[PDB]
UniProtKB/Swiss-Prot annotation, chain B:
The gene is panC. The reaction proceeds by a bi uni uni bi ping pong mechanism. Was identified as a high-confidence drug target. Changing residue 149 to C: More than 1000-fold reduction in activity and 120-fold decrease in adenylate formation. Disruption phenotype: Simultaneous disruption of panD and panC gives a mutant unable to grow in the absence of panothenate. The double mutant has a highly attenuated disease response in BALB/c and SCID mice; immunocompromised BALB/c SCID mice survive on average 36 weeks as opposed to 5 weeks for mice infected with wild-type bacteria, while immunocompetent BALB/c mice survive indefinitely. In wild-type mice bacteria grow for 3 weeks then undergo a steady decline, bacteria persist over 8 months in SCID mice. InterPro entries: Pantoate_ligase (IPR003721), Pantoate_ligase_C (IPR042176), Rossmann-like_a/b/a_fold (IPR014729). This is Pantothenate synthetase.
């Protein structure tokens, strides 16, 4: 067990160090909360931290790891924003006690060997043109869960398909952790927080409001049914200069092999220049 | 409320949540939870695993019995054997309890799973690693026990544990053998007398190789092949010398020699430690 200074930010890179500290804390009555991130922290991540913090007796572990396995060749891994100094400053300001910042070598000493194979949902929506993406996500999340052994793990609803797949991982492998989904944090005009928003120029930033405007329009149109909801969203997206829609889909809340009933999720993905944005919203039909 | 647990008796649980809750409660009382995963039809090979688990100070032994569809059924007989060994927990789930959402998220093994046994059964080890991962998460044992007879399985399990950062010790237990050397297996009873006599060639080949090895790796392999070549009706699927982790054998040092063969319709496996020179 390495040093743990209470009420200060303790940064650990070695998986064994955080595993030892987490174990010791749990054995003294603290409940360990995990917030897995890839850094480049914004107010949406801080909402996750605050949700974790409010669990009574909580000690909060925020992991920061740009996981190479969830990227494909072609520039994306190198292009992911890295703002380590801002990240840790924000964690300190939020009163987080543990940051876990592992190296690639510590997480993947044997390269890709045993991995997690997601169910068929991973081949759809975000996974359609990225068939190995969610395998990378679920593999790293499984590993973080085994290293840290938290009581609860926190994910944002912005990456809704990812959240659903993590619930699948937890159920399917009998993991003893509660998955907590936290609502998307938005800019004042509705834009969902994302580390990718920094790649919107002022014109693209203005146009990007169409995603949340389309979704909220759809949610209210939905008293008139699914077609009305989808057509309302499509109309808003069609009115938006330089928004290129990749998909707009209304599914059952679990995104799985069941038809839409009274409760759904409307998901959109769109490109503004080279920047791919996602958003989603709860839909009640009728 | 924690399910009833009666110390010193065989407590049988079919619900994953029940054994999870009892295991957690027991570990908090100062027991060390030992897991022995099986598919039932227990024989002396399984009992050696049980005895290895029992001897750990503070042990409570959980034997799982689950025929994993993803990778003989005598439930009353199996349970009687466990009771006689002083096992306090048997975990006997249904397929629907283990797979309430069907096959969905699974474990993808590394490339070793396509080799050796994975030749004829290319999805076998994915099934094994998936169910073992689930059992480890349900039971959360301190140590998990596997026989060395299924050596490739054992090595893949060790890969699983390392790769997913699992907090469990994997214990390999030496193969239990019949008086003539035949590795114990539920399959042995299917052999007719001619096949049962010829079947000794697997263990005889391996032990010959282990002693021939002072003369080097080729001498070891050639001695084993000669013994197999002296047996009728033994169709060898493979005979391979590998390092202990089943990578390529180094020039000198420790390795493992593995054999598999078909006798009529019955497939037999065996393996042995080899020290080169």
């Amino acid at each position: 067990i390495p040093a743990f200074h209470p009420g200060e930010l303790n940064v650990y890179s070695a998986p064994g160090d955080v595993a030892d500290v987490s174990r010791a804390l749990r054995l003294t009555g603290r409940r360990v909360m995990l917030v897995p991130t890839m850094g480049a922290l914004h107010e949406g991540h801080l909402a996750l931290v605050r949700a974790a913090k409010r669990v009574p007796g909580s000690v909060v572990v925020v992991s920061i790891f740009v996981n190479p396995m969830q990227f494909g060749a072609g520039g994306d891994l190198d292009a992911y924003p890295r703002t380590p100094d801002d990240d840790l400053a924000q964690l300190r300001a939020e009163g987080v006690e543990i940051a876990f910042t592992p190296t690639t070598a510590a997480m993947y000493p044997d390269g890709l060997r045993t991995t997690v194979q997601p169910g068929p949902l991973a081949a759809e929506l975000e996974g359609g043109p990225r068939p190995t993406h969610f395998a990378g996500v679920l593999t790293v999340v499984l590993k973080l869960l085994q290293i840290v052994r938290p009581d609860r793990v926190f994910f944002g609803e912005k990456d809704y398909q990812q959240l659903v797949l993590i619930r699948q991982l937890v159920a399917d492998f009998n993991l003893d952790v509660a998955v907590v989904g936290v609502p998307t944090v938005r800019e004042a005009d509705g834009l969902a927080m994302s580390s990718r928003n920094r790649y919107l120029d002022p014109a693209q930033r203005a146009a990007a409001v169409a995603l949340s405007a389309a979704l909220t329009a759809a949610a209210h149109a939905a008293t008139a049914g699914a077609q009305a909801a989808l057509d309302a969203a499509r109309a808003v997206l069609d009115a938006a200069p330089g928004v290129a829609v990749d998909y707009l889909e209304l599914r059952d809340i679990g995104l799985g092999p069941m038809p839409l009933n009274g409760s759904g999720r409307l998901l959109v993905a769109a490109r503004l220049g080279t920047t791919r944005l996602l958003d989603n919203i709860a839909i009640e039909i009728g």
